[PDB]
Amino acid sequence: NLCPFGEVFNATRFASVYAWNRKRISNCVADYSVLYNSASFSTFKCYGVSPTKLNDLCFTNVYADSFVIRGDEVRQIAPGQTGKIADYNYKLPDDFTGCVIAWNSNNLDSKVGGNYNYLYRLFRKSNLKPFERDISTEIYQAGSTPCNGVEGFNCYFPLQSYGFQPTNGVGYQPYRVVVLSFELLHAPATVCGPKKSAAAHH
Amino acid sequence: GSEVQLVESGGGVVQPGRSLRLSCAASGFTFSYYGMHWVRQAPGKGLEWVAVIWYDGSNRFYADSVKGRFTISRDNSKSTLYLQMNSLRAEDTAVYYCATDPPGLRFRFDYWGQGTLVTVSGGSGGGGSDIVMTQSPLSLPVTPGEPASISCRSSQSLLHSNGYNYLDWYLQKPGQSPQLLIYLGSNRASGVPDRFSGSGSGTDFTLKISRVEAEDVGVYYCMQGLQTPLTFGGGTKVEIK
Ligand SMILES: *[C@@H]1O[C@H](CO)[C@@H](O)[C@H](O)[C@H]1NC(C)=O
Ligand SMILES: [Ca+2]
């Protein structure tokens, strides 16, 4: 009953960041060590918890959040960050207990002429609360004239594509990101590390 | 909307092989939210897209005929767009327009400048994947007050899973710079009278004028904004009979 992290990290397609995907992990045996010793990840930052100490702990639920952003925004997937991604797209809490994993995906997510499929939110009436997800497409009212569902002066469609292109510098190339957050409820813990087994050993 | 101003400079007469830098001073709107384009028109010819730069400078695309020789850049703190042209050739001779592109929904030229003239004294490209736009008819003599319709087919579907058709129509009145008429297949631009309407989907599109007025005379172009390079039709000349 290994935890299905392969379905998250190796998913053939990744969500746009404004519509970031969440997978709930429960009732399985987690080995964060196979992730931590990988070397394919350019980013593996953990907040609060040590990644090796992670294999010795138990949680009620583990949430895997995945999306694509560009390289120089990966730094925004951290507590206390501001910027277009953290303010309008995916927001980590200041008390974040968990890990941010990222790697470069130019070879999958860029194409000549540009990849327009990946979108981010450029505007919003207010910053997102932590782990809030906004998937709406209302014309954004940048000025005092109401928009009433019509694009116009100071009336903007709020989602915009990166246009990822293979010759872009690395700070502009696409990065796949997995954020792991750990829930300890009052309930029983069902996600434990590999040294907890229910099978007899000889 | 009416107060948007784009003012190109830098044009002149230069020898082949020399360099020239175009400028476009923008006022009247938040320049740093818009992508910016250069579009050119050789004398007596249609419109040809040149280059685009993302609202924040992070991303640029070029037409193949200018790849490497031209560089597009911008200074958001001076609200100015630039075109650095190197190794000028005779075929580069044209009027160069800057145009704005609003956030989202891929490509659109919703405000145009005046042009600078640069004097150096419709194909699918080498690989065949560039979208070709074909318009019909070439000229359309019209009597005032009677309807008009013109058509545009594209070599590739402009319908996306979005449900959007990335097709626009642009009008160039005689002696004027082009202007947006219809965007995304069927939406009128601000101020376009309701006697204009665009229809169609996928690969076949039509523009209809319910009752042509003499101020509607010009050359109408279709254009796809689905992917780069951005490509225009050959244009349809609407004139009074
Ligand atoms: C994903 O990719 C390869 C197998 O194709 C392997 O290196 C890795 O362990 C797989 N699983 C995870 C969770 O990354
Ligand atoms: Ca746009």
Side-chain angles (χ1 to χ4, degrees):
Chain A
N1 240 3
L2 272 162
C3 290
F5 291 129
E7 285 108 287
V8 183
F9 286 82
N10 285 327
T12 167
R13 214 48 83 202
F14 260 58
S16 276
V17 63
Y18 84 95
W20 48 271
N21 194 249
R22 171 158 287 187
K23 192 103 193 139
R24 196 186 94 137
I25 311 269
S26 68
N27 290 100
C28 56
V29 177
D31 196 1
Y32 311 113
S33 148
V34 66
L35 304 168
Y36 192 63
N37 311 318
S38 175
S40 69
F41 306 123
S42 60
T43 296
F44 208 130
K45 289 163 204 233
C46 292
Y47 299 84
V49 299
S50 161
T52 302
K53 185 168 182 161
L54 225 39
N55 263 354
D56 291 0
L57 291 173
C58 289
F59 302 96
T60 325
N61 288 310
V62 169
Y63 297 110
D65 298 351
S66 43
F67 47 79
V68 164
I69 53 180
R70 70 186 211 202
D72 73 359
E73 309 175 313
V74 175
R75 61 147 218 83
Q76 278 175 65
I77 310 297
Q81 304 303 306
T82 71
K84 165 244 285 196
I85 303 309
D87 293 341
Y88 298 149
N89 285 270
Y90 184 84
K91 177 56 164 168
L92 281 189
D94 295 340
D95 77 356
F96 179 52
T97 294
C99 301
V100 181
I101 305 160
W103 64 105
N104 185 293
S105 64
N106 204 36
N107 51 17
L108 303 175
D109 287 331
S110 301
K111 62 163 276 196
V112 176
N115 184 3
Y116 300 110
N117 292 329
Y118 288 109
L119 308 176
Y120 55 84
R121 191 170 296 277
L122 199 40
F123 312 96
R124 199 173 179 265
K125 287 152 108 151
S126 69
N127 298 347
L128 293 167
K129 300 170 246 171
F131 297 113
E132 199 177 14
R133 183 202 290 97
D134 191 347
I135 70 170
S136 62
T137 53
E138 305 327 310
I139 308 311
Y140 176 87
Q141 191 189 316
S144 98
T145 290
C147 296
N148 279 330
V150 180
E151 298 171 68
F153 193 86
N154 274 328
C155 275
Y156 301 136
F157 197 79
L159 305 185
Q160 167 137 349
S161 89
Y162 288 102
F164 290 119
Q165 152 160 239
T167 43
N168 276 335
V170 286
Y172 298 138
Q173 296 181 6
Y175 278 61
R176 292 178 174 202
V177 181
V178 171
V179 179
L180 294 188
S181 59
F182 303 90
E183 198 171 58
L184 251 174
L185 286 170
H186 332 275
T190 77
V191 190
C192 293
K195 297 185 309 306
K196 249 200 91 177
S197 87
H201 296 311
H202 291 275
Chain B
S2 41
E3 293 270 330
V4 168
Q5 292 232 354
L6 301 158
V7 177
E8 301 89 333
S9 46
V13 178
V14 311
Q15 285 289 117
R18 313 279 195 267
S19 294
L20 245 194
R21 181 158 131 127
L22 300 194
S23 297
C24 169
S27 55
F29 63 107
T30 313
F31 180 76
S32 63
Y33 290 165
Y34 285 72
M36 290 306 292
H37 296 267
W38 288 102
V39 174
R40 73 189 179 173
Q41 185 173 40
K45 306 281 164 211
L47 306 168
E48 180 190 19
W49 170 83
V50 177
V52 57
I53 180 170
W54 253 231
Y55 71 111
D56 64 0
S58 65
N59 210 2
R60 289 155 267 144
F61 294 84
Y62 300 84
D64 281 317
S65 59
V66 302
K67 193 76 196 89
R69 298 186 301 117
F70 290 10
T71 300
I72 183 168
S73 58
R74 69 196 284 159
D75 194 331
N76 280 340
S77 78
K78 298 194 212 155
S79 298
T80 301
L81 176 67
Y82 305 104
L83 188 58
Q84 176 65 44
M85 311 184 272
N86 295 315
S87 318
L88 284 171
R89 266 113 61 154
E91 318 83 66
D92 294 318
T93 297
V95 167
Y96 284 77
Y97 305 90
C98 45
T100 51
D101 193 316
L105 298 176
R106 308 198 179 184
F107 299 104
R108 192 187 311 164
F109 307 131
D110 61 352
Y111 299 98
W112 296 65
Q114 262 66 58
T116 43
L117 175 50
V118 176
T119 324
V120 191
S121 49
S124 60
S129 69
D130 292 9
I131 302 177
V132 170
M133 309 284 288
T134 305
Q135 290 178 242
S136 181
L138 258 294
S139 36
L140 189 84
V142 186
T143 64
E146 293 308 307
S149 95
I150 61 190
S151 38
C152 171
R153 73 193 160 92
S154 69
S155 76
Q156 297 218 280
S157 184
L158 313 176
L159 179 54
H160 204 267
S161 324
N162 302 156
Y164 287 113
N165 289 284
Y166 298 87
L167 181 123
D168 302 345
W169 293 91
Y170 294 93
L171 164 63
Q172 183 158 51
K173 309 199 171 183
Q176 298 185 50
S177 66
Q179 81 199 58
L180 182 61
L181 244 198
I182 306 281
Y183 64 98
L184 295 179
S186 46
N187 303 116
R188 262 143 47 211
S190 300
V192 170
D194 55 54
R195 72 183 178 271
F196 288 101
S197 93
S199 67
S201 196
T203 54
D204 288 293
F205 294 91
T206 53
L207 177 77
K208 291 199 189 287
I209 320 174
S210 60
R211 280 141 46 77
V212 170
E213 301 192 359
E215 64 170 308
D216 300 329
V217 153
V219 180
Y220 292 80
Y221 299 92
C222 63
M223 163 277 205
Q224 64 84 19
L226 174 75
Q227 69 203 36
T228 62
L230 312 170
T231 49
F232 297 82
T236 296
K237 187 169 184 233
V238 173
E239 54 197 340
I240 304 292
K241 218 182 273 179

